[PDB]
């Protein structure tokens, strides 16, 4: 699957959770990749890639809702979007 790559990011690299943090990270140019949950508000979705398009950042859309993305990163709450500040030891940046 893909979540196993995400799990290695958490234990090795650095990341942010939530819409406000990622846009701040995306604004400063420190974000390498963002992940959007399927059930994200499409308006909130739409401004994200436009923000990404400005920052020249790869975009990937998670095949799951808020809960699945939250469990994907090993958190007990729901996450609508995550940002990859540094892979650390993962391989998501090169692939997909």
């Amino acid at each position: 699957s893909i979540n196993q790559k995400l799990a290695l990011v958490i234990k090795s690299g650095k990341y942010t959770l939530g819409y406000k943090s990622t846009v701040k990270s995306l604004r400063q140019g420190k974000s390498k990749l963002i992940i959007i949950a399927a059930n994200t508000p499409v308006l909130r979705k739409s401004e994200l890639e436009y923000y990404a398009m400005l920052s020249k950042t790869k975009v990937y859309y998670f095949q799951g809702g808020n809960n699945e993305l939250g469990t994907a990163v090993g958190k007990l709450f729901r996450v609508g979007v995550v940002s990859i500040l540094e892979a650390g030891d993962s391989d998501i940046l090169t692939t997909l």
Binding site: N39, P41, G65, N66, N67, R78
Partner: protein, 91 residues
């Protein structure tokens, strides 16, 4: 503690209306009062306003659904059936 054995929510009707009738209303009433997933906000915040009207306390979204549940079996078949024809006609 466990207040009742079997009547559950239907204990308010006392010893009347008949056991079988109390049995059937119990099954439907639990679905009526239950909380459901928000298909938009992904939360246990969907409740029934009136018969067939289900709304999300957060995210302020309302969807029309079953009188006693968020969606009945027939619509689930219909929605798939609609989707079956949709990709059959576009391609």
């Amino acid at each position: 503690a466990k207040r009742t054995k079997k009547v559950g929510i239907t204990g308010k009707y006392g010893v009347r209306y008949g056991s079988s009738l109390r049995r059937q209303v119990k099954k439907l009433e639990i679905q009526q009062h239950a909380r459901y997933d928000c298909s938009f906000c992904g939360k246990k915040t969907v409740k029934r306003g009136a018969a067939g009207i289900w709304t999300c306390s957060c995210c302020k979204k309302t969807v029309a659904g079953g009188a006693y549940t968020v969606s009945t079996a027939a619509a689930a078949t219909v929605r798939s059936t609609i989707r079956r024809l949709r990709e059959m006609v576009e391609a």
